Design a binder for this molecule. Structure first.
Ligand SMILES: CC(=O)N[C@H]1[C@H](O[C@H]2[C@@H](O)[C@@H](NC(C)=O)[C@H](O[C@H]3[C@H](O)[C@H]4N=C(N(C)C)O[C@H]4[C@@H]3CO)O[C@@H]2CO)O[C@H](CO)[C@@H](O)[C@H]1O
Ligand SMILES: CC(=O)N[C@H]1[C@H](O[C@H]2[C@@H](O)[C@@H](NC(C)=O)[C@H](O[C@H]3[C@H](O)[C@H]4N=C(N(C)C)O[C@H]4[C@@H]3CO)O[C@@H]2CO)O[C@H](CO)[C@@H](O)[C@H]1O
Length: 499
């Protein structure tokens, strides 16, 4: 049917732009020339990261950026479109460093969306940047607007959308229209900031790119998979913050949608989006990490899973103990807590003491270093089989990943994703999705199809009775009920009738 989106972020820090070279990996580890024609054909979007919002409340490059070098790098990316007429080079505004609550530019995000006049100035600057540098759309990665900033954020997205649509007409770009996307939270605590207005946030977007990773890390006391597809009952569980969002729903409605505690998984985040009315599955893009998160000080028994650990959370990494054995990139980056898939392959292949283990509930791999007590959670071509099948089964828009420089040299992770979506000879009809814990919540936007006897006036219905009435299947919350379903508080809408 419709091709699945494959959205790869291209992350290049300012110092690498200013010293850009394609022949010295100690200066630029992943230059644009490493995105070969074959890789360009497997991507639908490359998202250049990151631009910012400056104190003038406009989209802007980092002011330390050499503009001539910046244009040269972007030009190399947009030249890739010669190999793929569906490919878009987006640019992304924000990222954790600029836009987190304590980030260096945070107040500029709050203020740029605060008023109609600020939103107009900001929205115009976005489109100006995208036309001036040759980008194909705008991606916003503010992590994250708070519940009170959400209305301004929504209006800013609406205003950018209108201007982009004007630009599509002006440039006759109907075959490849300019797009607007955001990177969204992939876990319930950050998602709760804007969850109640999710339909308004998604309406002006082509896609919402869920960051369904970083679900574990040094900030948690217990090691865990950072991107489990489904839940493991032996793993940690979390309070479901969505049940406290300002939804106006009843106790039964909240309980049916927001089981708590719950397993913090990719499936949970996807279902939490689908549960809301007006959030179409085709706009939801599942993020996947091309890096692993590493922990030290883990005590064995379960391959390092669900263990206490002694991994610092500070930034910069607080000392020079680069304890992730074999991680040469970690020495370069002065941080043993993150390793690219590229590096993880070499760590597993070398004489470094890792076992590769597999959790058949979460459908994810992990590395365990028994001698030193190390645990690494990551994703690979095998976990991507289950995630790609889930994307197809749930009719999602596609996949997103952070970031291109972390795939191995041959681009095997990207090639795998492309194969699972597009290869005629690839068959996952027999791929067993396992018995891991599914997120069981149901909301107005994902009512299952059900059948039930028609409601009959005068009949006294016990608690739990199911009837069909005016297009839906309803269940009594208590008994005995005689009211017509939907006329009072006694009936829960639990399903839809097939047309
Ligand atoms: C250019 C720069 O600011 N470098 C910073 C550095 O910032 C990076 C790192 O913190 C990245 N962390 C990891 C594990 O890669 C971080 O990546 C985030 C990104 O911000 C989020 N946005 C997405 N999208 C898909 C849109 O994914 C996430 C990823 C993965 O979590 O990106 C920031 C830049 O925002 O941080 C260090 C420490 O402060 C700093 O020294 C400097 O090198
Ligand atoms: C204390 C610490 O180590 N701070 C890190 C910082 O960690 C952040 C980010 O990695 C967030 N990643 C995002 C926003 O993409 C991370 O958010 C993850 C989060 O942990 C998962 N959990 C949720 N919840 C709702 C609980 O959602 C997902 C999100 C992704 O949506 O939160 C941690 C801790 O706050 O990362 C930066 C850059 O990597 C690093 O410099 C350092 O400051």
């Amino acid at each position: 049917s419709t091709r699945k989106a494959v959205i790869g972020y291209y992350f290049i820090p300012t110092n690498q732009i200013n010293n850009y070279t394609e022949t010295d990996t100690s200066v630029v580890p992943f230059p644009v020339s490493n995105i070969t024609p074959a890789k360009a054909k497997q991507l639908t979007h490359i998202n250049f990261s990151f631009l910012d919002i400056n104190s003038n409340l406009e989209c802007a490059w980092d002011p330390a950026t050499n503009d001539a070098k910046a244009r040269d790098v972007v030009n190399r990316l947009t030249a890739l479109k010669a190999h793929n007429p569906s490919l878009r080079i987006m640019f992304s505004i924000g990222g954790w460093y600029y836009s987190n609550d304590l980030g260096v530019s945070h107040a500029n995000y709050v203020n740029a969306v605060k008023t109609p006049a600020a939103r107009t100035k900001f929205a115009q600057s976005c489109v100006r940047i995208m036309k001036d540098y040759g980008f194909d759309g705008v991606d916003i990665d503010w992590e994250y607007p708070q519940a009170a900033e959400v209305d301004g954020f929504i209006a800013a997205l609406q205003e950018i959308r209108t201007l982009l649509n004007q630009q599509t007409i002006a440039d006759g770009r109907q075959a490849l229209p300019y797009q607007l996307t955001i990177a969204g939270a992939g876990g319930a605590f950050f998602l709760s900031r804007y969850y109640s207005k999710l339909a308004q946030i998604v309406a002006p977007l082509d896609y919402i790119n869920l960051m369904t990773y970083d679900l574990a890390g040094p900030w948690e006391k217990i090691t865990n998979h950072q991107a489990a597809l489904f839940g493991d009952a032996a793993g940690p569980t979390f309070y479901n913050a969505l049940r406290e969002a300002n939804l106006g729903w009843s106790w039964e409605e909240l309980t049916r949608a927001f089981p708590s505690p719950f397993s913090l998984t990719v499936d949970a985040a996807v279902q939490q989006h689908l549960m809301m009315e007006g959030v179409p599955s085709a706009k939801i893009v599942m993020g996947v990490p091309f890096y692993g998160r590493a922990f030290k000080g883990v005590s064995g028994g379960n391959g390092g899973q669900y263990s206490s650990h002694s991994t610092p959370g500070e930034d910069p990494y607080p000392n020079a103990d680069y304890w992730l054995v074999g991680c040469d990139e970690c020495v370069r980056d002065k941080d043993p807590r993150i390793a690219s898939y590229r590096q993880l392959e070499q760590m597993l292949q070398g004489n470094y003491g890792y076992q590769r283990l597999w959790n058949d509930k979460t459908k994810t791999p992990y590395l365990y270093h028994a001698q030193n007590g190390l645990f690494v959670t990551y994703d690979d071509a095998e976990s991507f089989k289950y995630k790609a099948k889930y994307i197809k089964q749930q009719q999602l828009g596609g996949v997103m990943f952070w970031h291109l420089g972390q795939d191995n040299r041959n681009g095997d992770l990207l090639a795998a994703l492309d194969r699972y979506f597009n290869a005629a000879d690839y068959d996952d009809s027999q791929l067993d999705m396992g018995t891991g814990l599914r997120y069981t919540g149901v909301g107005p936007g994902n009512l299952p199809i059900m059948t039930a006897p028609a409601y009959v006036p005068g009949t006294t219905y016990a608690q739990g009775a199911l009837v069909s009435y005016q297009g839906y299947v309803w269940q009594t919350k208590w008994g005995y009920i005689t009211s017509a379903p939907g006329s009072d508080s006694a009936w829960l809408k639990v399903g839809r009738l097939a047309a």
